[PDB]
Amino acid sequence: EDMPVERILEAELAVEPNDPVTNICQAADKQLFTLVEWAKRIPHFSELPLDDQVILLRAGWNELLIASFSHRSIAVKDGILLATGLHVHRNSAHSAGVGAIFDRVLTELVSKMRDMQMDKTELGCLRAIVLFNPDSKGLSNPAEVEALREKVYASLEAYCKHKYPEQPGRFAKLLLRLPALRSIGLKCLEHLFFFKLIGDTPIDTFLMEMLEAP
Amino acid sequence: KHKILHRLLQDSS
Ligand SMILES: CN(c1cc(C(F)(F)F)nc(OCCC(=O)O)n1)c1cccc2c1CCC2
């Protein structure tokens, strides 16, 4: 066990906390600082070269944040809970002109996480898989990252089989939220690039740094 | 040019 699910859960538990789009952007900036602390507690992340640690977090931050507020929001009806303590109701999101992408988050992520009772170990592992993205451009050693990804999904499958032996399809169900998370990430990014371009919305320095070119 | 991310990743604690 070079990738124990106990350490991945510890990482989740260690970091656990009108324009709605202004509140969302403040929350995203705040959570980017927490995301660096989270990543440092994932086994073997901090032993990668610093340039590769940067490429992985620049590639994955939007998906990692989306995964976290989505899991956080499973107790909420028709909304999301931000790390800042604030709720965005689907009605506010529709009235701010981001209804369609907000409903995608509710339907494809929050609802599906709620229905299967995805647990914080499962969430941690999915986020670790996102983080260890071996397709990220410019990695010095994509094979090392691929090896870390393989160890995360080996540990996750063993955890699922042990913890939920009645649900043989559960491992595959977890992995098959990742295409939805990818598509929703890209659409959320497109919204952010627009907010920046129109200048309609304050963007704080870490969020702004993540939107700057590579 | 990613000042803030480099600084946070380097700092141990
Ligand atoms: C809430 N929000 C986001 C989207 C994003 C991302 F796209 F940059 F990754 N980041 C955040 O972080 C909030 C962090 C937190 O409180 O845990 N919040 C969102 C949800 C639905 C639609 C849209 C948006 C932001 C753009 C449009």
SS3 letters for chain B? Answer: CCHHHHHHHHCCC
Binding residues of A for all-trans-retinoate: 72, 83
Which tokens sit at A108? 């494809």
Chain B residues contacting A via beta carbons under 8 Å: 1-6, 8-10
Report the DSSP beta bridge partners of residue A74. Answer: none
CA distance A54 to A72: 26
Method: X-ray
N-term to C-term CA, chain B: 24
Say if the Cβ atoms of A36 and B8 lie within 8 Å: yes
Helices A50-72 and B3-10, interaxial angle, to 10°?
Answer: 90
Which tokens sit at A137? 């451009």
Sequence-distant (6+) residues with CB within 8 A of A110 are A70, A73, A74, A76, A80
Q: Residues followed by a break in chain A, C–N over 2.5 Å? A: 17
Q: Could you tell which of A32, A69, A102 is best to mutate to test the pocket of ligand 1, judged by most ligand atoms within 8 Å of the CB?
A: A69
CB A118 within 8 A of CB A174: yes
Resolution in angstroms comes to 1.9
B12: phi then psi, degrees, rounded to nearest 5: -85, 150
